[PDB]
Every structure is written in C-alpha cells, then in structure tokens.
C-alpha cells in the first residue's frame, strides 16, 4: 500500500544496495533465499503466491562485473533475474558515455522494468535512487533515468541518495567534471537529494566505530542504516508518523533548495556499547554534532533551515520535544530567521535492527537527522573550483566531446551550479 521503488545505479549504487537489501531482509525476517518462515514488507517487497518475497528494486549498471557479483553471491535467489540489468561496456567515468551513447538502450530497458514494477504497486510513495555523483554510470545513466522518470511518472517523489566527491580525498580525476554535469542534471529532476561524502563517513567510522581501516562495506552499512531509519515510518507504526510526501513539505522551503545533509546517531561499536545511557537528549545532540554529519560540511558555517528527525526505538514525544527545545536553545546551532519552527520530529517504535557481522551495536534508541541547511553551499563551492581548475585548460574535455557533448553543456552546467550558489546565499541571508 505504501510501496517504494528502489533504483541502484552504478558500482556505488549497487554496493550500497547490497547492504540496504541485507538490512531490509534482516529487519523483516526475509531469508536470502527470498521467503520468510503484518504486511510491513509491502513497502520494499512484493510477495508471490508461492510465499517468496521479491524486492521492488532495480540494479542498473553498464558494467557486468558488479551485477554478476550479486548474481553469484548470497542474494542470488532473492532478486529478480531480469531486474538485475547489466551493460556490456562500462561508462569509463564518462558522463557523455553514460548519458548519450551507451546509456540509451540500457535506460530504455530500465524504464521497461520500472514500469513493470510500478504496475504492481497499489500505492507509490516514490522512488529511492541510489547512485554515485562522480562516475559515468552513476552520473550520466542516473541523470537520464531521472529525466525519463520525471517525464513519464511525473509527480512521484524521487529521493536521490547521492554520493558526492570528497573535498580533498578522491579516487577519480574527471570526478569534478561528471559531478558538475550530474548536479546540473538533478537540480531540476529529483525532489530531495541527500548528499553523502566518503571522507565524512570514513571519519565517522574512524572516530566512533574505531575502525582504523574503513571500507566500502562499512560505508554502505551506515548508509543502509540511514535509509532504513528514513523509511521506518512507512513500514512500522509509531507516534508522529512521517511520510515520504511529508519530507518535502516539511523540509523543502523552495524547489531549487532540496539538497540535504544526513547524520545518524548513535554510531557505537559492540565493545564500547552499554557503557553510557544513550538518552534521547544525548543522541539528539550527537546527531546535531558537526562531526557526526555524513558530509564534509561544517554546519557552523551556515544556518539550518529545516531539520527532520527520525527517532527509532523507545522514544517518547516529550523526550523529543525537550531535546529539540535544548537544541533550539543551543547557541552553536543557528537557524534562519524566516523559519521559527524549523523542526519536523517523527518517532517510530521499531528499534534499528543490527546486521550480524557489522560493527554497529544494538541500541534501543536511534536518530536520523536529515537537514536542509545553507551550509551545503560549501561543498558546491569546492566542486565549483575543482571543476574550473581543469576546465580552464579544457583537460579531459575531448573525452566527453567524443561521445556527443559540447563545450556549451559544460558551460551551462557550471553556470547552473553558480546560480545554485547564489540561491543558497540568497536563502541563507535574511
């Protein structure tokens, strides 16, 4: 009844989807074979007459290796074989390759399977698009798919949980290029874009979970926990229920401004667990801590516009009200003058399930704080100069030109990002 269609595009998308679907299977009791030994799974799973539950997900990639890893691994009997869509040639970190030449047929087939999935949903809260801003498969093909979805489905709420390049550390060279291109693409298509940075999540794992060698599996586990906390109100009942549609209405002040920072709390390992109270006020403070945010973006530089809190577990509305009153009275946290409330609290009675073999400990309370704040303009300022430094010499421009782009596309994308900077300044200032 509250079905949500999940899209996982690119290597990062599919790898975070592995953790996400492992988490959902553990949460709902679904074995990896597909079936479990009410009707809370309908948000993420559609059940057949045989009793087996199949996810309403679509794994899209122009590279076959990542999808074949899922086809061979534990969740080979869970997913739909045709839902796993694989390309032949990788986008090779080329937004042009993934958006103009290779991505056409793959995205057409993706729309076909997405249509088959959406025809099986009574209600449809929206789409959860998980891609990697900074890679040809993620950026180009994800942008094209989002454009097609906006064209055909229309007003369905698309939530893009994008992974943006980190400020200093990175793994690619043309990452600012295709990041700027994808940002220009998704400024006008996705309804709420959640920013994520590998550097920030690495720092989180290092200082909180005490992992000196963090990896993508740990990062994806944390992201999956965040998404599960976000969607918990759709699957499990609790006081102050929040909806996917309510996210935008309580969180998006203006259509252009829909990029959001995310912070989960508490992030504690099994060893140091049960050593502190972990009360509601403490976990709210931890969520609002600048370090706990999953983007390398100091919130102290900007001003919070809206903050949606998703509380999980033994949480009472008076506790959340007192905690938010303390947060408002805190002087480090600064809100915009035009949003006196700026807060959207939603509680749920389902504590976060812990993945066996993971580093997170079993906590009876959890907070996912997703905030629209003007501080996020800082990361756009960083990518805006990381891009322009190469674009001055037109480095790697011929690579993008070869697959059907023009200098005008880069110019338009960069101008759009500058306009986004200006808009962020305008909303932040009185």
């Amino acid at each position: 009844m509250r079905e949500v269609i999940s899209i996982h595009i690119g290597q990062a998308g599919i790898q975070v989807g592995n953790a996400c679907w492992e988490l959902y299977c553990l949460e709902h009791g679904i074995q990896p074979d597909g079936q479990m030994p009410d009707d809370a799974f309908n948000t993420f799973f559609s059940e057949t007459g045989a009793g087996k539950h199949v996810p309403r997900c679509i794994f899209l990639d122009l590279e076959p290796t990542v999808v074949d890893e899922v086809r061979t691994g534990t969740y080979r009997q869970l997913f739909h074989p045709e839902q796993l869509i694989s390309g032949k040639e990788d986008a090779a970190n080329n937004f042009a390759r993934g958006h103009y030449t290779i991505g056409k047929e793959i995205v057409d087939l993706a729309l076909d399977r997405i249509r088959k999935l959406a025809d099986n949903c009574t209600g449809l809260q929206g789409f959860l698009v998980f891609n990697a801003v900074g890679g040809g498969t993620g950026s180009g093909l994800g942008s094209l798919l989002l454009e097609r979805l906006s064209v055909d489905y229309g007003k369905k709420s698309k939530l893009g949980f994008t992974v943006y390049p980190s400020p200093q550390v990175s793994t690619a060279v043309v990452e600012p290029y295709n990041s700027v291109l994808s940002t220009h693409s998704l400024l006008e298509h996705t309804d709420v874009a959640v920013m994520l940075d590998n550097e920030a999540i690495y720092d989180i794992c290092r200082r909180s979970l005490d992992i000196e060698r963090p990896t993508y599996t740990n990062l994806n586990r944390l992201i999956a926990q965040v998404i599960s906390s976000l969607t918990a109100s759709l699957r499990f009942d609790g006081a102050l229920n929040v909806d996917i549609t309510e996210f935008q209405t309580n969180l998006v002040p203006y259509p252009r401004i829909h990029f959001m920072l995310s912070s989960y709390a508490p992030i504690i390992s099994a060893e140091k667990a049960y050593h502190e109270q972990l009360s509601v006020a403490e976990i709210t403070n931890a969520a609002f801590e600048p370090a706990s945010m999953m983007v390398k973006c100091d919130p102290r530089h900007g001003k919070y516009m809206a903050c949606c809190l998703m509380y999980r577990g033994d949480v009472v509305p008076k506790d959340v009200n007192a905690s938010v009153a303390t947060i408002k009275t805190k002087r480090t946290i600064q809100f915009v003058d035009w949003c006196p409330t700026g807060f959207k609290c939603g509680i749920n009675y389902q504590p976060p399930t812990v993945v066996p073999g993971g580093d997170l400990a079993k906590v009876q309370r959890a907070v996912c704080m997703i905030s629209n704040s003007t501080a996020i303009g800082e990361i756009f300022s960083r990518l805006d100069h990381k891009f322009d430094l190469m674009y001055a010499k037109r480095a790697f421009v011929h690579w993008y030109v070869g697959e059907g782009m023009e200098e005008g596309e880069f110019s338009e994308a960069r101008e759009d990002l500058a306009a986004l900077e200006k808009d962020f300044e305008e909303v932040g200032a009185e």
């Binding site: 805006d384 322009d388 674009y391 001055a392 005008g408 960069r414 101008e415």
Partner: peptide, 22 residues
C-alpha cells in the same frame, strides 16, 4: 571561481559574435 564565471560569459559572447557574423 569569478574568473571561470567571466570566462563562460566571454564564451557566450564569442558564440553570439559568431552567430552575428553568420
């Protein structure tokens, strides 16, 4: 950043100039 903004403006002006020449 201001440099590359003004560079894109210059590129647009050059494209307009070429179109006018055509």
């Amino acid at each position: 950043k201001e440099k590359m903004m003004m560079s894109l403006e210059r590129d647009k002006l050059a494209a307009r100039v070429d179109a006018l020449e055509q």
